[PDB]
Design a protein around this ligand. Structure first.
Ligand SMILES: Nc1ncnc2c1ncn2[C@@H]1O[C@H](COP(=O)(O)OP(=O)(O)OP(=O)(O)O)[C@@H](O)[C@H]1O
Ligand SMILES: Nc1ncnc2c1ncn2[C@@H]1O[C@H](COP(=O)(O)OP(=O)(O)OP(=O)(O)O)[C@@H](O)[C@H]1O
Ligand SMILES: Nc1ncnc2c1ncn2[C@@H]1O[C@H](COP(=O)(O)OP(=O)(O)O)[C@@H](O)[C@H]1O
Ligand SMILES: [Mg+2]
Ligand SMILES: [Mg+2]
Ligand SMILES: [Mg+2]
Lengths: 473, 469, 43, 487
């Protein structure tokens, strides 16, 4: 054996090979086992290399040959990944043949510094009324989606991806948004339902799905967010815009904890590695808005964090809250009360918004924000004497922020419905009907009043009340 | 002299030297790198091997790779040439404007000024921020801390202070970005160029910038505060003008040390922190100070993890400050900005022999009404408002007007609201609260006192609202 | 024995949220009365 | 000579592992090649673990280390009075060397059962709430406890300032030398503290021992024991000393740092098992000596910082269990206008009455009762109308006596002055007066009695009690003053 370029396994157990030799190996280099497996050299020690195995480590035996590749771990990037489902190392797992990418990128590359960046300027439209009006997201931002299991977190992410079609089918190049969904720790059938949802919506054509599922080795789940990020950075740096979803970062931290403990790096708070903050901070800092000298491109991140029994004060949740530009808080109570999407508007925050979220949206959501804040102050009354004029508008508006799944809305469609509530045209309608009203009203406006949804408040003001009156029969 | 890397584990690198062993704190330069990689000696392990912490990523490092002992701790450019520039932990320019051509360099490690060098001078520094100036005023050359959980308004507050204090300042300012968002570094840089505070076309810039943000490995984050305070130290000792030092966020210096503590071989202390949390903070904090040689007014933003003020990091920070501005989520959620807790923000100069009896009496009267208000809210929770005595309803009415008159539109927040920033002189602040407490505005609605400057704007706001009624 | 003023608000509990709404109700009714009285003092 | 010297094997985080020093004792002072001092805390089969009393960054693998032959000790005596020293007793005030005749081991055993006698001499703070309701005697250990910024240090400083009255006089039995130990504080804070004591001319009977936040952990661990040994010089030589440990929370943190880095097994809150023992051996050295052993005393005022008022935390638990009582301070009381912010309900002195003059014992006895009665009805004042006159009497007395417990900073009172204002309250001369006017009355009444009734104040002092003639005299003075009060 050439001990500079190759080594032999000393011991192998639970995804970690200790390897003799590999004297010339770099930290974070990819190695290759004689059995076909790949690995990463994480622990360089005087008498051994701690290699973390990217696959079924149970195929490796004491004595097996391990070889340098000479390369720091990297992944394929490029538009060839669009419409494809891949693993954390960029391999096709959709059965549609090889990725024909002519470019690769290291997974752990530094985030852009102060200079290459510019103030966030363009809207990232989710097509979800509660978000686009009250928690608006800009391109280059990092907005956390956080809540307990089954509060609707993934659903926000998927609606957002689906909403981009209206832009990606358009002729305006600057409004286009390429999507990356990173699935970490999920079961394969859930990811399959996901790509099916995306395919039915014609959303896979502009989406890369990176999947490191529950039976994929811990290193692959650790790596997945960084691989997906590199693929987004190719858009960021080549004058285009990408959105990345990390679903979810709770499961990535768990995998990082396993790997690190088995490398014999001492357990920190909650047995997590000492640098779990850094694991997430370095990732999310890679989402950025680039200046024109660097191409004007952008990458926006929607990380997802699972809380336990509503505990946002928990270790990993607090880390990521402190990193992100804003957060969308989802709650079980709200979900079951009928508030779906289950967003806590009071707690949910987004950073200002470019002036540009829209302009006609800025009008109507401006008054709704004021009207709901005043409402929230009295909401808790839920007998009542005159506290009911204090409740009226707010209760109607709360019903108007409810939204079904897989039907993300155009900004003008959102404005038209918010308007009806905000101009007090539902103040005497039974709050339980508003759900029925909105769907029926919106369907009728889409079908017969497409001209009204145009240029998106003198003629428009008079024409909306014309429909709303006759409709509210 | 030359060593060889023998181990790499994350940010922690062991290096063996055949002859001369580099002392602890020495900066070592890794050979064969595209960009400069410094290892700082942290420990002598024995058998001619030192353990170090890296100042940048360790990807690509090989066992046997050569390391030169620089002969000194990390040394950075100091002096007028840092003004208008943005530098690294290790003193490299990161504004793409070229080399920093200084004559003078300084070690980022240094001894804290001795007990005999302490200054006892205490003079109010007026900010124009009503809550601060009234209840916990800052002192010139004093140590100021802004405590708060996530998103409560530390950064907004610190930028308003740079707008109010630093833009009226006759000497030099230093800003250290420590473990925060790179995008905020971009914001700050371009904001200061727009306002002429940084001048790119001449030698007139009055602020030096140092950044080591959350994208950086923990070694860089643990040392950047030292880089920024080193720049400030030069100005304090070698020049004749007063210095301002702003740091966002100093928690991240303590967090960064916890990130490597286990790999440095320590048993963890409580809440997963390093056993050296208090002394590490002490040796750093005790350098950030006014001395008999010169004055530094220091303003430090301090993250309070999960809003828990008893967490060892912010808990240990309190002893290092002359004034504390404590921000509160409950207050921010009521819509009061700045979200300062009037019953948990303090100042060593809040003393009638220093600010005068009128200032002191109004401050303590405001706090008394707000404290009495807390007891009444418990009763209201059961009894309701209408059932209270007329005296209690009056305490509630007034305390609520006071709470809202403590809010204030910040110039730097003209982006969120669209409302113009306000600066309130001290004597105007005292008069307004005096008048509210005396009952002079019992006839106006509390909403008139929300988000205004001086008391006359409240009287005028009540007049606009009466017309719109 | 130990001081505890404001603990009800501090809990963000039902009782806490209710009391906040009850104060707000009271002072919005006061504002209506005070703005009218200010209108009639206007002339 | 590997018996008297050794060499550094490894050094990091302030722990030096040393080969050799075969003849070194546990807890011996050693000296490093640079000049730094260390202490041998771990004697192991193949190494000594040495904690460094200074900048451990200056030590390198291979450095020579030597024995001193002596268990860690410090200078002691009257030459330290007026001086600010570090934990080793070196001067840091720039006033030159300490002209010290004697040294004392920092870790000397406390006096045992026999040499002591029960606490029976007043240690007067000059603070009305304390001297009447939480009285402290000479030889007592009384904890000052509360969250940050409730007024803890201010209690200790006003106490120190109060002793001038005695220290200026001719009665050597009432004299009290003071030691203030600052632990983990920043240097500018200590300088302000010293400025205050100097301005009060209290530095002349005070020693300040300071181990500040940038001082190595072993120095902060050491400082209380060093200050303690200074006080014991006075205790053993028939004199009386007061020692303040500000604060023990910071001393335990420093000890925990050393212990963890020595890889001693960690316990609750990562404190080592001997953290109780750290504080117990320190505070048991405060004692009242019987006449057969000189008559002297050492009184201790340790300070503990609580977090969110949790007295069940590990270190506050330990210290509460060690001391003879606590003065508890609270932020809520502070902002209500109760300053000093003493929670009387939660405060205790287990020596109690024995540490009070008869004059105080008179009036305090009744005030304690009436405040305890009032504290049970206190809620009924803020909301209670149709209540019987009996509970109305308790509320009127209570709110008025409560105002008499308020006190400004830096103004400690002579015992006779305290008892004159307390007498006014407990005899019912305030009962018809507005609560807002009680402090105005107190100030005015005190000015009146000081200006023109020194003879009455003097006798009450000298005799230490209120005679029947004194009570009849004081009865008339208050009556006549009150009659022409509001001009
Ligand atoms: N706007 C909505 N209206 C109605 N139902 C919804 C909405 N959003 C999500 N749901 C439903 O709630 C359930 C949970 O949603 P989702 O899978 O997005 O939650 P999650 O928080 O990602 O949960 P987990 O990751 O733990 O499975 C799904 O059945 C989904 O169909
Ligand atoms: N009796 C009093 N009357 C008025 N003000 C007081 C009184 N006692 C203390 N203060 C003020 O309270 C503030 C805090 O007091 P002090 O510093 O003694 O508290 P502490 O508990 O020692 O706080 P720290 O946490 O800073 O050590 C100081 O500004 C002091 O001047
Ligand atoms: N003085 C203020 N006026 C208006 N809004 C504020 C103010 N301070 C904070 N905010 C709101 O809080 C958000 C976060 O404030 P920031 O200073 O970034 O928090 P952090 O404490 O995390 O630094 C801002 O984007 C803004 O929405
Ligand atoms: Mg999900
Ligand atoms: Mg911030
Ligand atoms: Mg104190």
């Amino acid at each position: 054996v050439d001990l500079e370029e190759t080594g032999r396994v000393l011991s192998i157990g639970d995804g970690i090979a200790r390897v003799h030799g590999l004297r010339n190996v770099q930290a974070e280099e990819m190695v290759e086992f004689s059995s076909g497996l790949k690995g990463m050299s994480l622990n360089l020690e005087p008498d051994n290399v701690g290699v973390v195995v990217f696959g079924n480590d149970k195929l490796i035996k004491e004595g097996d040959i391990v070889k340098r590749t000479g390369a720091i771990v990297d992944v394929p990037v490029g538009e060839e990944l669009l419409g494809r489902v891949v693993d954390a190392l960029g391999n096709a797992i959709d059965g549609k043949g090889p990725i024909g990418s002519k470019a690769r990128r290291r997974v752990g590359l530094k985030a852009p510094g102060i200079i290459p960046r510019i103030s966030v300027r363009e809207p990232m439209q989710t097509g979800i009324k509660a978000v686009d009006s009250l928690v608006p997201i800009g391109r280059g931002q990092r907005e956390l989606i956080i809540g307990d299991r089954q509060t609707g977190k993934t659903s926000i992410a998927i609606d957002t991806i689906i909403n981009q079609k209206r832009f990606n089918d358009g002729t305006d190049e600057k409004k286009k948004l390429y999507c990356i969904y990173v699935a970490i720790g999920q079961k394969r059938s859930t990811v399959a339902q996901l790509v099916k949802r995306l395919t039915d919506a014609d959303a896979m054509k502009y989406t890369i799905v990176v999947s490191a599922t529950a039976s994929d080795a811990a290193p692959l789940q650790y790596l997945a967010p960084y691989s997906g990020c590199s693929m987004g950075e190719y858009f960021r740096d080549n004058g285009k815009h990408a959105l990345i979803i990390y679903d979810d970062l709770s499961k990535q931290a768990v995998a990082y904890r396993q790997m690190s403990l088995l490398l014999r790096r001492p357990p920190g708070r909650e047995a997590y590695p000492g640098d779990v903050f850094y694991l997430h901070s370095r990732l999310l800092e890679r989402a950025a808005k680039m200046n024109d000298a660097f191409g004007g491109g952008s990458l926006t991140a929607l990380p997802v964090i699972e809380t336990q029994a509503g505990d946002v004060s928990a270790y990993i949740p607090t880390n990521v809250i402190s990193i992100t530009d804003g957060q969308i808080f989802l709650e079980t109570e709200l979900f079951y009360k009928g508030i779906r999407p289950a967003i806590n508007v009071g707690l949910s925050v987004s950073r200002v918004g470019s002036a540009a979220q829209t302009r006609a949206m800025k009008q109507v959501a401006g008054t709704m924000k004021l009207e709901l804040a005043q409402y929230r102050e009295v909401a808790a009354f839920a007998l009542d004497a005159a506290t009911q004029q204090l409740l009226s508008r707010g209760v109607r508006l709360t019903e108007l922020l409810k939204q079904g799944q897989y039907s993300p809305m155009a900004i003008e469609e959102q404005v038209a419905v918010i308007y009806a509530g905000v101009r007090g045209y539902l103040d005497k309608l039974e709050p339980s009907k508003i759900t029925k009203f909105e769907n029926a009203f919106l369907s009728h406006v889409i079908s017969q009043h497409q001209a009204l949804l145009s240029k998106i408040d003198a003629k428009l003001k008079e024409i909306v009340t014309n429909f709303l009156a006759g409709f509210e029969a | 002299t030359t060593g060889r890397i023998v181990a790499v584990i994350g940010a922690v690198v062991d290096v063996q030297f055949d002859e001369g062993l580099p002392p602890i704190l020495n900066a070592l330069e890794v050979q064969g790198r595209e960009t400069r990689l410094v290892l700082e000696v942290a420990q002598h392990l024995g058998e001619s091997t030192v353990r170090t912490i890296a100042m940048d990523g360790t990807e690509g490092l090989v066992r046997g790779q050569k390391v030169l002992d620089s002969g000194a701790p990390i040394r950075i450019p100091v002096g007028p040439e840092t003004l208008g520039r943005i530098m690294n932990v290790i003193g490299e320019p990161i504004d793409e404007r070229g080399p920093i051509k200084t004559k003078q360099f300084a070690a980022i490690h240094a001894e804290a000024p001795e007990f005999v060098e302490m200054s006892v001078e205490q003079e109010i520094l007026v900010t124009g921020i009503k809550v601060v100036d009234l209840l916990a005023p800052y002192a010139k050359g004093g140590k100021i801390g802004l405590f708060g959980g996530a998103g409560v308004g530390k950064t907004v507050l610190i930028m308003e202070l740079i707008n109010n204090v630093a833009k009226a300042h006759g000497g030099y300012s230093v800003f250290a970005g420590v473990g925060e968002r790179t995008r905020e570094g971009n914001d700050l840089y371009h904001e200061m160029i727009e306002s002429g505070v940084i001048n790119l076309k001449d030698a007139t810039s009055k602020v030096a910038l140092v950044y080591g943000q959350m994208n950086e490995p923990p070694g860089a984050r643990a040392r950047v505060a030292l880089t920024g305070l080193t720049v400030a130290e030069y100005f304090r000792d070698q020049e004749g003008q007063d210095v301002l030092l702003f740091i966002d966020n100093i928690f991240r210096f303590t967090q960064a040390g916890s990130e490597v503590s286990a790999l440095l071989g320590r048993i963890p202390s409580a809440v997963g922190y390093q056993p050296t949390l208090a002394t590490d903070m002490g040796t750093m904090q005790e350098r950030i100070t006014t001395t008999k040689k010169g004055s530094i007014t220091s303003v430090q933003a301090i993250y309070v993890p999960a809003d828990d003020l008893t967490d060892p990091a912010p808990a240990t920070t309190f002893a290092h400050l002359d004034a504390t501005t404590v921000l509160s989520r409950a207050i921010a959620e009521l819509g009061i900005y700045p979200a300062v807790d009037p019953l948990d923000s303090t100042s060593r100069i809040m003393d009638p022999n220093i600010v005068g009896s009128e200032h002191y009496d109004v401050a303590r009267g405001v706090q008394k009404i707000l404290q009495d208000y807390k007891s009444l809210q418990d009763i209201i929770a059961i009894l309701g408002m209408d059932e209270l005595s007329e005296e209690d309803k009056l305490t509630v009415s007034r305390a609520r007007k006071i709470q809202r008159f403590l809010s204030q539109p910040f110039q730097v927040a003209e982006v969120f609201t669209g409302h113009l920033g306000k600066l309130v002189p001290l004597k105007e602040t005292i008069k307004g609260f005096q008048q509210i407490l005396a009952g002079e505005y019992d006839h106006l609605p509390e909403q008139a006192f929300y988000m205004v400057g001086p008391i006359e704007e409240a009287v005028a706001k009540a007049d606009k609202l009466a017309e719109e009624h | 024995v130990r001081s505890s003023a404001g603990a009800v608000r501090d809990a963000g509990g039902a009782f806490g949220k209710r009391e906040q709404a009850e104060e707000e109700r009271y002072f919005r009714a006061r504002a209506k009365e005070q703005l009218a009285a200010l209108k009639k003092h206007h002339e």
